[PDB]
Amino acid sequence: CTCECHSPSDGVCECTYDPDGKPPITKTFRLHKDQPCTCTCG
């Protein structure tokens, strides 16, 4: 299982987890002050 985040817009970060077997889980949220646009599946 992996994941990849990106900055689709200012102060915005959309992550996408690709779990084995299950479909891709996309999680979009608002980036905080100097908040790193990353994720962690395991």
Contact call for residues 37 and 13 (beta carbons, < 8 A):
yes
4-22 burial string, b = 16+ CB within 10 Å, else e?
Answer: ebeeeeeeebbbebeeeee
Token duo for residue 35 = 């908040």
Nearest to 7 by CA among 35, 25, 42: 35
**7/22 Cα distance (integer angstroms):** 24
**11/30 Cα distance (integer angstroms):** 6
Provide the CA 25 distance to its chain's centre, in angstroms: 9
What method did the depositors use to determine the structure?
NMR
